[PDB]
Amino acid sequence: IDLGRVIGELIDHRKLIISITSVFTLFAILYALLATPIYETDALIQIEQSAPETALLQSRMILGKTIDDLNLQIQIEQKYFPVIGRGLARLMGEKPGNIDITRLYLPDSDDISNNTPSIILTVKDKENYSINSDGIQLNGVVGTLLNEKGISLLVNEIDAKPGDQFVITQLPRLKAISDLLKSFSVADLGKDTGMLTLTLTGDNPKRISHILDSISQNYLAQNIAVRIIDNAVTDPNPVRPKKTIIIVIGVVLGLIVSVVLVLFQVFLRRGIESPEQLEEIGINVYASIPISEWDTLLAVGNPADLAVEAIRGLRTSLHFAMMEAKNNVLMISGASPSAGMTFISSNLAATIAITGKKVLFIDADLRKGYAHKMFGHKNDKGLSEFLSGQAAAEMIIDKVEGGGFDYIGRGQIPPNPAELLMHPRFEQLLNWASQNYDLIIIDTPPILAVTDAAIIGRYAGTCLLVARFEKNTVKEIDVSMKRFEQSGVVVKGCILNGVVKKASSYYRYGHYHYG
Amino acid sequence: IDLGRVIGELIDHRKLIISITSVFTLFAILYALLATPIYETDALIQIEQSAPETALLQSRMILGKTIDDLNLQIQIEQKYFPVIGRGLARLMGEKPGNIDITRLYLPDSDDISNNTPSIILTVKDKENYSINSDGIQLNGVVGTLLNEKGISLLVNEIDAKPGDQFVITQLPRLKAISDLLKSFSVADLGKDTGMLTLTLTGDNPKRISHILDSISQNYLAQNIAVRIIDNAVTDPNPVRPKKTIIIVIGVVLGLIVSVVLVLFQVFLRRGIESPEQLEEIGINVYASIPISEWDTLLAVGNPADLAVEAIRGLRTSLHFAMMEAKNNVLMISGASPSAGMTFISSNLAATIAITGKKVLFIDADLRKGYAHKMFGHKNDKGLSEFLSGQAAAEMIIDKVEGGGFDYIGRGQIPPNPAELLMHPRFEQLLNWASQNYDLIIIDTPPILAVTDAAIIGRYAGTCLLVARFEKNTVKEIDVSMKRFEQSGVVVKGCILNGVVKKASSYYRYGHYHYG
Amino acid sequence: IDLGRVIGELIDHRKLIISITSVFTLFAILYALLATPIYETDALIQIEQSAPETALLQSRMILGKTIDDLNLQIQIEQKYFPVIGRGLARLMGEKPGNIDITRLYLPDSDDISNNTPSIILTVKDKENYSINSDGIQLNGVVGTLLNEKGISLLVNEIDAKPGDQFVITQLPRLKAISDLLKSFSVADLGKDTGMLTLTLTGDNPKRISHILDSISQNYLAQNIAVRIIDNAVTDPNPVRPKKTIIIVIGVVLGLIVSVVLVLFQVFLRRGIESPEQLEEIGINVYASIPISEWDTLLAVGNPADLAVEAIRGLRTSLHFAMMEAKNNVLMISGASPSAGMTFISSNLAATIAITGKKVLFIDADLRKGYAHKMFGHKNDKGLSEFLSGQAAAEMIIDKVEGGGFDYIGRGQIPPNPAELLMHPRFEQLLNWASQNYDLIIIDTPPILAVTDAAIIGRYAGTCLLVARFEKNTVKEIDVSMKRFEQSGVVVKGCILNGVVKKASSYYRYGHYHYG
Ligand SMILES: Nc1ncnc2c1ncn2[C@@H]1O[C@H](COP(=O)(O)OP(=O)(O)O)[C@@H](O)[C@H]1O
Ligand SMILES: Nc1ncnc2c1ncn2[C@@H]1O[C@H](COP(=O)(O)OP(=O)(O)O)[C@@H](O)[C@H]1O
Ligand SMILES: Nc1ncnc2c1ncn2[C@@H]1O[C@H](COP(=O)(O)OP(=O)(O)O)[C@@H](O)[C@H]1O
Ligand SMILES: [Mg+2]
Ligand SMILES: [Mg+2]
Ligand SMILES: [Mg+2]
Numbered sequence A, B, C: 001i002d003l004g005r006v007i008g009e010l011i012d013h014r015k016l017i018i019s020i021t022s023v024f025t026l027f028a029i030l031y032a033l034l035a036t037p038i039y040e041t042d043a044l045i046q047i048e049q050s051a052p053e054t055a056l057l058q059s060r061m062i063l064g065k066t067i068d069d070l071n072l073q074i075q076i077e078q079k080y081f082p083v084i085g086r087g088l089a090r091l092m093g094e095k096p097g098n099i100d101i102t103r104l105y106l107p108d109s110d111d112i113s114n115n116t117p118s119i120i121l122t123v124k125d126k127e128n129y130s131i132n133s134d135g136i137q138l139n140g141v142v143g144t145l146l147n148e149k150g151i152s153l154l155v156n157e158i159d160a161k162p163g164d165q166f167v168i169t170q171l172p173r174l175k176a177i178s179d180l181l182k183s184f185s186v187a188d189l190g191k192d193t194g195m196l197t198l199t200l201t202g203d204n205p206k207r208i209s210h211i212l213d214s215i216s217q218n219y220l221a222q223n224i225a226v227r228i229i230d231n232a233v234t235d236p237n238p239v240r241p242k243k244t245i246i247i248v249i250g251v252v253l254g255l256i257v258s259v260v261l262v263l264f265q266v267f268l269r270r271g272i273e274s275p276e277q278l279e280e281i282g283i284n285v286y287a288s289i290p291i292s293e294w295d296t297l298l299a300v301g302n303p304a305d306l307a308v309e310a311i312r313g314l315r316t317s318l319h320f321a322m323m324e325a326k327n328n329v330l331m332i333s334g335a336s337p338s339a340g341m342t343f344i345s346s347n348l349a350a351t352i353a354i355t356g357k358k359v360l361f362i363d364a365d366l367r368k369g370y371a372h373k374m375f376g377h378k379n380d381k382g383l384s385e386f387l388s389g390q391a392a393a394e395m396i397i398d399k400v401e402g403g404g405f406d407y408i409g410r411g412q413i414p415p416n417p418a419e420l421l422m423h424p425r426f427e428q429l430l431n432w433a434s435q436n437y438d439l440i441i442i443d444t445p446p447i448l449a450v451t452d453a454a455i456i457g458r459y460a461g462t463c464l465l466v467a468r469f470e471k472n473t474v475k476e477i478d479v480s481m482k483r484f485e486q487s488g489v490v491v492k493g494c495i496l497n498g499v500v501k502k503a504s505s506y507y508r509y510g511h512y513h514y515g
Helices: A003-012 A014-034 A052-057 A060-070 A085-091 A173-182 A205-223 A243-267 A275-281 A306-321 A341-353 A371-375 A383-387 A424-433 A452-459 A474-486 B003-012 B014-034 B052-057 B060-070 B085-091 B173-182 B205-223 B243-267 B275-281 B306-321 B341-353 B371-375 B383-387 B424-433 B452-459 B474-486 C003-012 C014-034 C052-057 C060-070 C085-091 C173-182 C205-223 C243-267 C275-281 C306-321 C341-353 C371-375 C383-387 C424-433 C452-459 C474-486
Strands: A038-046 A074-078 A098-105 A118-123 A128-132 A137-141 A146-148 A151-159 A165-170 A184-187 A195-202 A227-240 A285-290 A329-334 A359-363 A397-399 A406-408 A439-443 A462-468 A493-499 B038-046 B074-078 B098-105 B118-123 B128-132 B137-141 B146-148 B151-159 B165-170 B184-187 B195-202 B227-240 B285-290 B329-334 B359-363 B397-399 B406-408 B439-443 B462-468 B493-499 C038-046 C074-078 C098-105 C118-123 C128-132 C137-141 C146-148 C151-159 C165-170 C184-187 C195-202 C227-240 C285-290 C329-334 C359-363 C397-399 C406-408 C439-443 C462-468 C493-499
Touching (some): A014 A085, A052 A195, A128 A151, A137 A146, A137 A151, A173 A184, A195 A205, A227 B060, A227 B173, A275 A474, A275 A493, A329 A341, A341 A359, A341 A439, A359 A371, A383 A424, A424 A452, A452 A474, A462 A474, B003 B243, B038 B205, B052 B195, B052 B205, B060 B173, B060 B205, B098 B165, B137 B151, B173 B184, B195 B205, B195 B227, B205 B227, B275 B474, B275 B493, B285 B306, B306 B341, B306 C452, B306 C474, B329 B341, B341 B359, B341 B371, B341 B439, B359 B371, C014 C085, C014 C243, C038 C205, C052 C205, C074 C098, C098 C165, C118 C151, C137 C146, C195 C227, C205 C227, C275 C285, C329 C452, C341 C359, C341 C439, C341 C493, C383 C424, C424 C452
Parallel strands (some): A285 A493, A359 A406, A359 A439, B359 B406, B359 B439, C329 C439, C462 C493
Antiparallel strands (some): A038 A195, A038 A227, A074 A165, A098 A151, A118 A128, A118 A165, A128 A137, A146 A151, B038 B195, B074 B165, B098 B151, B118 B128, B118 B165, B128 B137, B184 B195, B397 B406, C038 C195, C038 C227, C118 C165, C146 C151, C184 C195
């Protein structure tokens, strides 16, 4: 491989690359803007050692004392239903509410799993509130204590707007101690001095400084039954989430996944990409037809279409190839369905009719031929009725209205399509038509699916295959050619159909307007 | 690859290389001259240890004491609207102003984000000044204190020119302490001695020395409730920005980006560069025409042009190639539009007419032919009107004025250009003209876009393709030749057009004046 | 590559190699002889530790005390206008002057940048002197103090010759301390003993020893409020610049730059170097003509020239090649101008005329032919006038005086040179001349520039190309041959012209005298 190939591949897949990278970067931005910020407070302690003091600070006696002093076993969480409600509320500038609770005693359900009882408190005004544990609604008032239904609560100084809801949990003392220990750090910072740096993290910048001051006071008071050089203050800039590294990670991750996905698609492609793939195998390509982005004949509705220009190129190529052919019959076939055989056949018939030659178009697709719909029809008396013997050769020929050539439709779909085509009446029809017309074009079903084209091809002096631009593979076309050669039918060459513009190709068609 | 190639590439791209390097170096110089200089002061302290003293110096008690003593919570910034105003003002030799403020109390808005209140003070004279916080204009006088609108201010010794504006911020004490700590360093410098080196950086060389003296005095006074060997002095040479390394980095960065960009363009080029690329594929090149930097025929306006000399070379080559041709008709075509087919065709007709031969020029580009504009025209009765049957072969031929040959214009643009050219009247016209002229030159549309040239080429004894020097690729020309061969038209060879001088080429044309 | 090639390349480029190396070595010698010498003094101190004493010696208290004692803030510099004046003065044996100044007070301008005031003192005699700060001229006398114009000066013991000028600077105390600190070093030299080695460098060998003695005394005196084992003495041999390493570096740098430059030129050469380069491509070389270092014909002025000998070799080669040629016409052409086509053509005509054969020389360079100047002329009625029809074939032929052959000049420069040559009168002239002469030689313009030679070559039975020895490339000659072949002109072979002696060649011509 070379760099031009990969650059063209990136240019072609730019829509997917951009979409994937933008999606990943949007998710990264949403996380870096909706994650709750985490602040850090710290304090500095003087030791007159300092290895066992580190274990004494993190022990459950000191931390438990702090928790008892500060009532850290009463967890209060402002309620937002979604997982992004809190982040949005912070972004909108809404001030978070808080409640001071000095006494809480839940009935302590203490079942197998839920060791932490919790209730929901809804604020009705600055004074009263509603409480529900499991649907049991009670009304309480700030100030006066509540002792009802096995529930004790004392609420002071509700500072929020009415309608807010708060989850109040009474978690066990060990759970509180473990929570405090997880966010608490002690370090020496000199490895030999009596200086210890205590650190604490949390989402409330005032609460963490109060908690660290409590820890320092408890440790100092316990030791004298040590000097606090720096009492706890909180850095106002949150330490998490780290926004810029998150966004950079998101962008780079999006780019790498996009690149590997494009590499995956490029390594898994097998369709035809240029006429050179067919010409390596030894197959003549007579034209490349682009997709016309424009029940009508294209060569009649839009004669100045680019696909019709490419078909005029095919017309001039054929006028030279079909010299020294045994008769004036051309058969168009292909490997797979919807490659474009009917499109090519009918539009070629129209462009050859505009030059003043008499053209007969035969729809010999007895299984799915729709040419009568595309030309305007009297669907009676098609090729079926003629072959089965219930029609004559003069009742089946009709005129294309905006075209200028004659045609024969398929007729009624028969039960034995391949066997009807083997009747000698088919060759009688071809020999009769070959004397009243300058050209006969026969449209057929694909050869890999059924065998009708190989029957028809015995009486055609020229045979061309239609290959679809991206769908078909080189192996398919080669197998189709060999299946034709085995039945005694020589295939003159190929027509590539439905070509589109690709930056990776480096093959230049003339698929652009000139005028 | 070899070194001659890369040297030629650099010579060719020197304009881009020089421009990019000069832009990057100019940006580096602008930064190294507009960045505010940062000075450094330092002091030396004697310790009679020295590991915990390092943590005691950087603690908030000592630094906070210094900040309280020196009023470092009053931030004063001289106001320049742009981000380069201060640098320009320093470069112009303008002396920065300063104000001594001993008492500041802003109303402490203290909203969600802006924790630092700030006002703007405009100097009206040496005595009075104007103050605005949020549009509230007040007048104050140096000396007498101001207590108005919840704002307290005391300003002493305004030393600036009238019209200056200063931002006065009252930042919080922790913010001041963090600012001081960021620019403050303590080191041991012997790792065992009682010597400590204290360092401080900042943009004011006197303020930083005062701050470091205050820190040293506070630490010394606190310890005795230590010897200061060296009091703080400031190195007069700024430590940042480091100009020479910045400029060197800018130059080297410019060179590397230029080299990679030129390498990128060289690896992405696919156009034809020399006739050897076409001759490898097996295509005869009959001439290489340079760009003529000079609605007129070039071979008539400037007969001594270099392009006309190259076209005389083509004339002598053709006089030998067109021997043993079936008729005296030459068709010029090409792959893509604006390769130079009309330019070559018409100028070749002029140079062959000056040698005394009778020449007919036919503009068979029925879609975009403009030869009638370039020759001086009676636009009626062109090739269209003749082919469609509404004109005779004697009414369509006209004389080029400054030329010396006959011509046929396209006529009115028809709706069916390819089908008009297929009329037997075209061959009748060619056979009639072939007996009254020594040479007929036919100009055509490009073959990749439309098929008209392949129709015309059946009656031309000689056919040449025009390839544009840098635009076309070898694949394009090969595809054009094969599309012609498929239609039964043998292409004699190619003409390379619009060649220019490239140091990387190492192919020598004769594109220079001799006279 | 092999060693013989590179040795020959060095032999050929020896002039450049020697010049570059000599230039670099001369610059190195000039630096190593003009750089001011820097002396070193040192002293040895005993410590009864020694880690903090190192920081105490380099502190600003001790160094500042030394500077105050020795008045090191008075900088005196003897004035030389150029940057090599001092070095030359030292080399000429001139004794540097000195002035003892005990009191200096400049007005202390103290602007934004120039913190160091300076004045210029011009010595008028042993007693009086002139002083100028900014053009303000004052007269002072040794002894009596000066207090004028805000300037205080006391000068003692002027020891210099009259006319000398000295810059006297009053630099700030910190600048003096930093200057002293930069040149001062302290080391332990045992890493554990009480021995310290103090070192000081400077351009004055007595001043530095005095300064180091002052530093030692101040440190010793301060400590007792330490033993000086060795007081300061100066090594009389300067420590910088180190001459031999500088000169060796200069020589080696010159050699490496010379070698890379010669390698650069050798890798960038593309011209023809030997006839073998042309014979690989399949081109017969019939002669190699050397440069003749000798408006005259060389074969007449200096018949025993080496170039004329090589041309006699060409004459004998041609007498055998031109057998079985269709006529007796020889055309000489070439690729590029000033390859030597006229030189070869005319001198070949002279050497063939001395053998008793009748020779006609035709100057068919209608664009820049100067043969009439070189033969002695009647410039009227040349080839132009004949072709345009205004002269006959008998009025245009003239005699070369010192030669022995006939010639036709170009005539008046025409506006249509290529079209004049296409007249059938040219072939009439050639057919008439072919019956009255044994040989006709035609000189032409180069074929890459214009096409005239390809027109003339149709009527020449033999055609030779001239290639210039170093200017032309193999690609040029091959392109010229192919441009001739395309026009139906067969080129017999080549003549290499202007060959010179190259040690790298290893191709031996016979370009030496034999006689
Ligand atoms: N180059 C093309 N541009 C636009 N439409 C095309 C092109 N080729 C085929 N088609 C359309 O795509 C559809 C499938 O092609 P069709 O010719 O009917 O398939 P089949 O090979 O089975 O006979 C048709 O509706 C056809 O009109
Ligand atoms: N070697 C050239 N030097 C200067 N101008 C040129 C050269 N070749 C083409 N042109 C000019 O560039 C324009 C486009 O070329 P043209 O011959 O008209 O294109 P086309 O190939 O479509 O017929 C024209 O205006 C032409 O005169
Ligand atoms: N081998 C040579 N030795 C000395 N002078 C030479 C040699 N070859 C050419 N010259 C001189 O160098 C100049 C340029 O060569 P000239 O023959 O006039 O060039 P051109 O190829 O254009 O006809 C002339 O003055 C010529 O006399
Ligand atoms: Mg179909
Ligand atoms: Mg054109
Ligand atoms: Mg000459």
